[PDB]
Design a protein around this ligand. Structure first.
Ligand SMILES: [Mg+2]
Lengths: 87, 205, 156, 80, 82, 129
RNA sequence: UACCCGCAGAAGAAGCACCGGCUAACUCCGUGCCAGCAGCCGCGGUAAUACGGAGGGUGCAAGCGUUAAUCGGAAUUACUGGGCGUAAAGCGCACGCAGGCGGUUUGUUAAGUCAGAUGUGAAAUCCCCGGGCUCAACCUGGGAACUGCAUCUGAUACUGG
RNA sequence: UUAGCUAGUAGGUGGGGUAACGGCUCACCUAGGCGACGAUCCCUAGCUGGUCUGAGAGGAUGACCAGCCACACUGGAACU
């Protein structure tokens, strides 16, 4: 913290990354349904969370949670994702 | 961009007088003045620090009928000015055109003062001013133009001004139905139920 | 006239062979609107009961604070147990600018227009101890004129 | 009167050219420490007369060479 | 080269002109040379409508400036009114 | 080892207040006297007694008030590793002007409020409050 | 076109989000670790103020939400404004160059530094005081500011030479 | 976890060249030049007035307005 050390080396402010990189700084991105299925969550909760494996515009293959209760989703379907993790 | 719902329902929320009707019929003969509206309105909660600052600011807006963004513009203007900001803020509130018509008692309520300015029945320095949110400069006159001098809701409001305390900074006339903005008022020239040291701090988190 | 504000409602526990004895604790502060203020940390088996012990502590053991007209006289910082807290006088008509316990302790201190900032621990017990220590050793121009053997105008 | 500078004669090997380094002593824009900063210049001497390790006095001139636009005016304390 | 022309600086349907020394190859947003005054065609009463430094103008015509049409009109009509 | 006699001086003042001593002595300097002839004038010490022939020794008298001390704070602004040169407009106000800031300008050593009335800035040595 | 009069009727003109705490605002009923909810802590395993519906209420408003994206809060890289006995952190020590740093006193120098003065730092923008559009947004007058750099005249306490 | 880089390179003399000065070009000498105050190499990028945030310090940022720069199917070259 001596200023000579501060002269020889600047304060490296830490660089943070996105947790949602597949959108690549976009609000929403178009996607293609690849597999629609359910998934049991981790220990404190017990459900069958409806979820779909998605091929995106940029070739990314991601999973994205189906909100709500009940849907009409097929594979090979055009959807749109907004973000947000599921805990 | 106006509130149109039940007036005394807002009075029941804030619990105090908001002058929203003519006061001819007694206010407590129109509503339970100490029960908040709806189901869980009787039981008073241990109300928090955040709520009373909100309720104070929600009082002053609903005193003058001012929506949040336009009220925030008054906050930005008063913060730009000098001295006590809340005193600057109340001066901006007293600077409102539709306020002074109620303060001259030409309309029975502020909303009954606002419709006149809306329906263009006012002349300010001989000029019609449609904007209700117009800022009144000192030493100006606010005259009823002669199309709608003959409205019965004008002269009955003059008697309701006789019922109220006459303001000090307003050289008001009666036979011509005009007035004169003498000077700006003080914090002291208004009520004491509006805290300077709360509405400042609410917008200064 | 000594206005009173509770600060903390809290539930701590001792542990015995039978189990855990929950005990409710409370922090309060009193003040007269002049430069007299006093805090109080009470503790009992009951929420409306520990506050009265907290008040009764605070009604005693006060401190005399040299205020200015509606604010402080010079900026100063305050520490107690890793709770470094800076405070500062302000211009007239700006309110108290502080958070947590510091909003309460200055309002019963009768100031009206301050600037304040807490660094480090925002633990409401030790954060109000740091406010008091800074307000305690804040001294008048009149005293430092007498301390330095001068006048006000010999300081300005 | 003229906008002249001094500095340290670093090199004198190449003909009709000397390398002179100049200390500029400047504040850091953030930390505020005063730093010795070095500006070297290729200066056209005549005669190859400058001793190495010397304080010279220089002047900005018209462009002499590809890397050289500087000509000395005089020399103080030439010795070692 | 050096020009003195009218430069639209105002809202839609209500023009206002900064009559400045500018360049005859540059533009209205872009490069002027020196700001020598202004003009309002919606100059109302109780306000000036043309306040120009009419002596530095004479300095540049002495250097061989170029004067536009309204600029030659309004400098005349100022002197035909003042 | 010896990187400053000035920071030596102020700390010897600082540790002598808490030690409740009446006399703090040290070897003297030309700059040391030029500071010590301010704080008597500004009323933060009582006496300084510069003595010594082979080597001058400055001996101070600490000012105590109501039992406790007078020097509530004593700092160092321009340290030897980092110097401070502020203009006449950036002269500070120690404890909102109630304390004093020792500045050395080309007109010797004075306080900041005198230097503002002198209208010329310089090197801020220390803060005394 | 701006603006001015007629005309007619309350007429043609309000909606989103939210209510477990965080944070302003709760009941009822369906539901039973299912369906789900979810910024965080976390709710649902038959009595859920956290799910869904209803009622009521809160927040805004011609918009209201969500996502993206940046600073702030974050002193969480701590110049201002951090720490290293055990919470992350003093090299296993010693040597030592460059490096940074320097006792005391006198002159000299005036480099740094400070002061003054010129030049420039375009306009716009922002700030301040005005003006104009019925106000406001906006437009615009004047001012300050543009924290600099260059040059010249000093200054001599300190730091240098 | 990019440390060596450079042969018209670096300097000179002479000739040539351009509106202009100068490896600008050429010839002939000299071996210099550069770099740990980051050369070199790689990645990304039009730059500034400004904009956004921040109490400030700063941080991020360059649509719109400006000032400059660069480009015009691609790669080239001159012409006028
Ligand atoms: Mg004010």
């Amino acid at each position: 913290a001596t200023v000579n050390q501060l002269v020889r080396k600047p304060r490296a402010r830490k660089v943070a990354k996105s947790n949602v990189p597949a959108l690549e700084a976009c609000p929403q991105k178009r996607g293609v349904c690849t597999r629609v299925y359910t998934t049991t969550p981790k220990k404190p909760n017990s459900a069958l969370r409806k979820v779909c494996r998605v091929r995106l515009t940029n070739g990314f293959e991601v999973t994205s949670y189906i909100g709500g209760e009940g849907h009409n989703l097929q594979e090979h379907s055009v959807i749109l994702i907004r973000g947000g993790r599921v805990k | 961009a106006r509130y149109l719902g039940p007036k005394l329902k807002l009075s029941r929320r804030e619990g105090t007088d908001l002058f929203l009707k003519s006061g001819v019929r007694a206010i407590d003969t129109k509503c339970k003045i100490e029960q908040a509206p709806g189901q869980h309105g009787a039981r008073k909660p241990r109300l928090s620090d955040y709520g009373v600052q909100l309720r104070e600011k929600q009082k002053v807006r609903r005193i003058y009928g001012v929506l949040e963004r336009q009220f925030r513009n008054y906050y930005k203007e008063a913060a730009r000015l000098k001295g006590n900001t809340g005193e600057n803020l109340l001066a901006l509130l007293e600077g409102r055109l539709d306020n002074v018509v109620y303060r001259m008692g030409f309309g029975a309520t502020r909303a009954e003062a606002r419709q006149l300015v809306s329906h263009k029945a006012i002349m300010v320095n001989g000029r019609v001013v449609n904007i209700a949110s117009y800022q009144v400069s000192p030493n100006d006159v606010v005259s009823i133009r002669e199309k709608a001098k003959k409205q019965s809701r004008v002269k009955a409001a003059l008697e309701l001004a006789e019922q109220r305390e006459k303001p000090t900074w307003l050289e008001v006339d009666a036979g011509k139905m005009e007035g004169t903005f003498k000077r700006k008022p003080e914090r002291s020239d208004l009520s004491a139920d509006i805290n300077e040291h709360l509405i400042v701090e609410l917008y200064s988190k | 006239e000594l206005q009173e504000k509770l600060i903390a409602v809290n539930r701590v526990s001792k542990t015995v062979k039978g189990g855990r004895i929950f005990s409710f604790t409370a922090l309060t502060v009193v003040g007269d609107g002049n430069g007299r203020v006093g805090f109080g940390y009470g503790k009992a088996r009951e929420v409306p009961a520990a506050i009265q012990k907290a008040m009764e502590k605070a009604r005693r053991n006060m401190i005399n604070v040299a205020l200015n007209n509606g604010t402080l006289q010079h900026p100063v910082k305050g520490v107690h147990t890793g709770s470094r807290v800076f405070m500062q006088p302000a211009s007239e008509g700006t309110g108290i600018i502080a958070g947590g316990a510091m909003r309460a302790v200055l309002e019963v201190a009768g100031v009206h227009n301050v600037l304040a900032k807490a660094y480090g621990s925002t633990n409401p017990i030790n954060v109000v101890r740091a406010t008091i220590d800074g307000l305690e050793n804040m001294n008048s121009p009149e005293m430092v004129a007498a301390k330095r053997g001068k006048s006000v105008e010999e300081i300005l | 009167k003229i906008r002249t500078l001094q500095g340290r004669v670093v090199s004198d090997k190449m003909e009709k050219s000397i390398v002179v380094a100049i200390e500029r002593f400047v504040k850091h824009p953030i930390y505020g420490k005063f730093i010795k900063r070095t500006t070297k210049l290729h200066v056209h001497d005549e005669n190859n007369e400058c001793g190495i390790g010397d304080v010279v006095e220089i002047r900005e001139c018209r462009p002499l060479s590809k890397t050289k636009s500087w000509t000395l005016v005089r020399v103080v304390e030439k010795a070692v | 080269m050096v020009t003195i022309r009218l430069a639209r600086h105002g809202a839609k349907k209500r023009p206002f002109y900064q009559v400045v020394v500018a360049d005859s190859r540059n533009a209205r947003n872009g490069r002027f040379i020196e700001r020598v005054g202004f003009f309002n065609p919606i100059a109302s009463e109780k306000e000036e409508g043309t306040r120009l430094d009419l002596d530095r103008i004479a300095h540049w015509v002495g250097q061989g400036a170029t004067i536009s049409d309204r600029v030659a009109a309004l400098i005349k009509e100022v002197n035909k009114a003042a | 080892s010896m990187q400053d006699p000035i920071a030596d001086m102020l700390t010897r003042i600082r540790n002598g207040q808490a030690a409740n001593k009446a006399a703090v002595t040290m070897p003297s300097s030309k700059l040391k006297v030029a500071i010590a002839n301010v704080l008597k004038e500004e009323g933060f010490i009582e006496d300084f007694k510069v003595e010594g022939d082979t080597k001058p020794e400055l001996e101070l008298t600490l000012k105590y008030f109501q039992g406790k001390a007078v020097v509530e704070s004593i700092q160092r602004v321009s340290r030897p590793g980092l110097r401070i040169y502020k203009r006449k407009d950036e002269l500070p106000k120690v404890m909102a002007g109630l304390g004093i800031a020792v500045v050395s300008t080309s007109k010797g050593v004075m306080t900041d409020r005198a230097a503002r009335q002198a209208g010329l800035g310089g090197e801020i040595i220390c803060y005394v409050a």
